[PDB]
Amino acid sequence: RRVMLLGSAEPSRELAIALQGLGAEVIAVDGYVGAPAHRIADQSVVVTMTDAEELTAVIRRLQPDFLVTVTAAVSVDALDAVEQECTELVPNARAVRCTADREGLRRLAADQLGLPTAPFWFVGSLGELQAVAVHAGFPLLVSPVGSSVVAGPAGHQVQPRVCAESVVEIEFLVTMIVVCSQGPNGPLIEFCAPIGHRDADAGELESWQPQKLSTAALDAAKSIAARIVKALGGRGVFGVELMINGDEVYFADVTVCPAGSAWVTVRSQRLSVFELQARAILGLAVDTLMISPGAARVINPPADALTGALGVPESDVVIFGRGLGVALATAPEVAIARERAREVASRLN
Amino acid sequence: RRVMLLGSAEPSRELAIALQGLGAEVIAVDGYVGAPAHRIADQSVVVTMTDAEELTAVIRRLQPDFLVTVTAAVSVDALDAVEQACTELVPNARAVRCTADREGLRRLAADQLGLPTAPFWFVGLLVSPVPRVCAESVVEIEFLVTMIVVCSQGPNGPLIEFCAPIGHRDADAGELESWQPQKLSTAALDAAKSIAARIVKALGGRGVFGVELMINGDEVYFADVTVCPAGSAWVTVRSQRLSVFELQARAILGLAVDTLMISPGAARVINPPADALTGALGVPESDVVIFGRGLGVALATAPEVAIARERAREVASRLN
């Protein structure tokens, strides 16, 4: 059983450990020579993965049982070549293509599915912008298809590309991790507990699990998460990005790769997002049981700093090279778990 | 920060992962070419580890910050020289020597310390080869129990932590079965901590120690201690917040530890087809660790040890 990982960054390494515990040989592919998953993989490969010819030869020679796309820098055309009884793609070349095309994924979510999003318009003129502002009002979020905030410049109520978004009030950003595998009885679709996340003080990301939601908010979230994921199809672990304001839930995005916010799961769930995606790739049963509330801080290791960081109760750390590290804590409550993680991170950075 | 592992087998691999999560480069040393920790280590080394000359040159050239002895086939004479000259040993050489000398460890436990053991005699009943030959009186036993003792430094100096007792026994098809926690009476648990703590402090140094005991209601007997992660410790990979390997990674490096339990659990060490895993991972709260030339660990957790053992039985059965 041979799995091939397109991408060899930090989560590619943990996934590779996970897959090796379950008995699989892993090939780690990337562009440069010293990539993280190269060090512990069974076989390392260097190719400009953004090269449809060069990538496709590599896949034909090695001929892996499973082809896992863990990065965004990849030839989607090369992947559809391989799809077009020798290798299962997990995720599908469909999902890889849909989620790298930002325009097409929004239009898939809001138009084909009836998913609720923040009002958005794709323009291609100045005049197109002019209308939207008159129609939509302020503030707007003009973004290339950096992201400027058009916060200023209809007489009656009955009245390349650049993306315009109306701005909505938001309480929480939330990551819904959806897992699609096979069980001993066929297809499984599992939901993790909502993961709350946000940008923190020193340019770090903070996450925590579980984020509490109302019944109506949680029903909406499962519904939205489940529907975008079934449209993509195939086995895999999907991170579905949502915006929440009390009862309202908005679709923002989905990634076929383990999000930075998922790092909390390494300590807060029985099976981490990496153990889940190892099992999903290989078509094995999964559950989404939680160990305990937790929080994480992704920073972007002096001997003194480590000693101090691990002095914080129920804490853990994942050191990764230059400027990359994860601070982790668990606790009987999310609030304690976030305070401990901020302590771990503070003693570390 | 560079740790060197004497021994490169399956537990040496998990310890190596653990140490790499905490930021350390690991050198895996063993006798043969394809050893398990070689595959994911940062640097691999092949040497005859019982050769004091050959081993000692290897340690002098590489010059690691920490020297960890994970196997028993190692030159203790080569090891004592490293403590006499740049490099911290976890575990310490005193411990490596005492626990490989079976006669001297018994005499240390029963004579110098006043530890209770089964009556024993060395001559020159359970007659066993120790030359000398060891004679033991046979006592009634309820449970075999592993007491995992952890010695590290915290942010406030020395720590000595006890894990929850691990029960273990030989089960069917040659599998070793373990489970955590094993319930003990107050008097039994007081005895066990006392015995575990006393043999470990006599060895000294940082490390993770497995202390073997025999239990019959009230009475606790010392049977053995190892400076290496016992096969019965495998249950901790899922039953404790920090597995025996994460604890020994933290102990080697002198970091704080705790011994919190996630949930009751059980394990079965067997000594791997796709349908075997599909069927095996269908058991609730189950996990597997595949190695090896047939080596595998079946794991389950549950709200009760009894369910956790039945699930692990099932996982192992669907796997074997």
Numbering used by the authors:
A (entry chain A): 27 to 110, 114 to 174, 181 to 188, 199 to 204, 212 to 352, 365 to 413
B (entry chain B): 27 to 111, 115 to 153, 169 to 174, 212 to 352, 365 to 413
Copy out sentences from the published article reporting this entry, exactly as the authors wrote them.
Glycinamide-RNase-transformylase T (PurT) is found only in some specific bacteria including Mtb and utilizes ATP-dependent ligation to catalyze the formylation of 5′-phosphoribosyl-glycinamide (GAR) in the third reaction of the de novo purine salvage pathway. The B-domain forms a flexible lid and covers the active site for ATP binding.
The MtbPurT crystal diffracted at 2.79 Å resolution at the SSRF and belonged to a space group P3121. There were two MtbPurT molecules in the asymmetric unit. Therefore, the MtbPurT protein exists as a dimer in solution. In contrast to phBCCPPurT, loop 252–255 between β11 and β12 in MtbPurT shifted by 13.1 Å away from the cofactor binding site. This structural rearrangement in apo-MtbPurT represents an “open” conformation. And MtbPurT recognizes ATPγS with a relatively low binding affinity, with the Kd value of 207.41 ± 8.02 μM. All four mutants (R131A, E217A, S218A and V220A) lost their ATP-binding capability, indicating essential roles for these residues in binding with ATP. In particular, loop 383–389 in MtbPurT is much shorter than that in EcPurT (loop 352–364) and shifted 5.7 Å away from the phosphate of the GAR substrate; thus, no hydrogen bonds with GAR were found.
